[PDB]
Ligand SMILES: [Zn+2]
């Protein structure tokens with residue numbers, strides 16, 4: 001017969017979906033693949049187990065009927081600005097619509113983004129109502145404490161030349177180091193320089209929108225926003241060693257209020273557990289903090305991570321604002337965050353920040369003083385005085401056991 | 402220099418088992434496929450590429466050792482019993498001290514620490530008089546004292562293949578093919594038996610004394626919870642997840658207070674291990690389908706998108722229980738027949754099954770729990786029949 005069609009080209013950042021080309025990361029037809037890697041982050045490993053055990057056909061293709069976004073997001077000019085969005089596929093939510101022809105031609109194209117709605121009921125919001133900080137309105141916040149949200153799950157899609165620029169290194173070096181430091185994950189990183197797009201086996205993020213997603217692209221609508229990096233031990237389990245769930249739920253409260261007043265709110269939840277070191281390293285460091293000579297002091301907080309991990313933080317907030325540009329955000333009126341790394345990345349990428357909203361002191365959990373004092377001393381935003389050397393030397397961390 | 406140390410999976414001593422060497426500081430010492438920290442090896446690569454981290458860096462493990470001694474237990478050296486984590490992975494600094502000193506760069510794959518966990522649901526349990534602080538397990542602040550262990554995945558491929566009733570050769574070929582060619586050593590290095598996959602692991606929360614988990618005479622209350630970010634963190638009312646998790650935590654605290662021990666394992670398998678994008682696509686299809694969001698269509702909506710109902714493969718889930726020495730679960734705070742079958746099929750007796758109280762089912766979670774009960778999840782009461790399952794129990798939008 002004939003050789004069917006080859007792999008469709010990708011022109012990253014092109015002005016239209018058709019010129020950009022679809023990300024084809026499925027494996028039903030190897031000849032159509034035009035990226036390195038596969039969809040769903042880490043969960044490609046579980047898909048492989050499902051095929052190996054006979055539960056899933058390696059020929060299966062998704063039926064996308066009725067799955068399209070509940071809310072229209074974009075397109076926006078940022079989707080085609082050179083180098084602006086390099087770690088997600090701006091077209092990834094609307095593939096069934098914008099690549100309908102390519103799907104009909106036989107290219108097996110999966111969404112990398114999904115957009116739905118939810119009622120989120122957080123205990124802290126229920127308490128906020130009881131305390132008179134929040135008042136149900138029936139539209140954004142119900143008397144039950146439920147907040148109506150749009151939520152979008154975004155899986156990672158990396159344009160390697162653009163990622164390299166974002167980190168000020170050559171694409172060749174980025175790709176060689178990705179290959180070497182993963183123990184040889186995906187040799188195409190070094191053997192297929194013609195493939196520009198990489199679907200890494202990492203978690204993505206989820207955006208929670210309070211109000212109308214279209215207002216995110218209108219700087220005349222007051223936007224309250226937080227980008228939160230995953231901390232399972234607090235975000236789920238409420239460990240009192242850190243500030244994470246308190247800051248997350250404070251931000252959610254402020255987003256609900258912002259929407260109620262006629263604005264819009266945004267919380268992005270990014271899968272970067274333990275400063276992207278993972279939870280094992282995180283717990284090893286907790287142990288060293290508590291056992292060190294002199295006790296758990298803020299002046300040693302970062303040193304304890306450096307000794308185990310060789311760096312303080314591997315989250316690389318340089319890629320974090322891509323989701324904001326995807327949503328059309330040009331201005332954040334209230335940024336519910338303190339990190340100078342996040343603030344520098346956001347403003348450095350062209351997003352104006354007006355008010356910085358620090359975490360209220362009464363929300364710092366009982367053993368989180370070491371963390372927050374160390375962060376303020378390291379340059380995180382605070383409206384008042386930064387802890388001095390003497391304050392940072394106080395043994396504020398609880399003993400082990 | 403020296404070559405790669407051999408691995409003899411399931412050996413009775415750490416020295417004979419050999420260390421998992423999954424670092425990249427000396428390629429000649431590597432004796433596994435893949436690298437440590439699950440997905441976060443990718444971020445380590447960015448750190449090296451950007452100049453922030455030296456590719457020569459080795460951890461200083463000083464003072465990082467477990468806060469609680471877990472094992473060794475007989476299960477650690479029973480052939481085929483533990484195939485998806487390294488039983489020695491928490492104690493490498495102790496049991497592989499000689500190998501570390503000889504220049505093998507060996508990382509822990511498990512870390513064990515302590516915490517005070519303060520959950521709003523537990524504080525409310527106290528306020529409502531369901532829980533009473535005792536000063537040792539539960540404080541008046543609502544804090545519960547726990548031991549917690551983070552466990553990253555370490556797969557013995559011959560053992561995983563057996564667990565899944567397929568040949569190791571086929572398992573490794575399919576892993577290679579269905580990931581788009583991730584790690585060709587899966588097919589080119591059959592001599593490497595151990596694989597460190599780029600997936601999330603799990604976290605165990607222990608209420609009481611970890612040593613009691615290995616004593617079937619001590620009443621054990623346990624739940625294995627699979628990650629649901631949209632509920633576990635954000636409290637979406639479409640599912641039962643955070644309610645069941647926090648109910649289990651309440652029951653574990655009480656079990657410890659009565660002189661027993663409690664265990665919650667939190668496993669990183671978002672969306673039935675399909676991931677969150679697929680999960681949300683299915684929510685949309687559920688709400689838009691002709692006839693509305695009905696329990697009799699709940700599983701079909703996932704099948705249409707994903708080709709299967711569930712990819713969590715609970716057949717590997719009991720490994721952590723065997724690592725902890727668990728031989729009996731007196732109170733299993735769970736309903737899933739797949740979890741129950743996997744636990745009991747691995748030889749662990751389950752005495753009481755503790756279903757989720759009806760009053761804890763969130764406002765839009767009735768479709769989910771009714772479909773699950775009809776699918777065989779444990780319930781003491783009536784199973785919904787065909788007519789009940791056809792009711793439009795799901796909220797619009
Ligand atoms: Zn935290």
Ligand SMILES: [Zn+2]
Nearest residue numbers: 629632640642
């Ligand atoms: Zn759930």
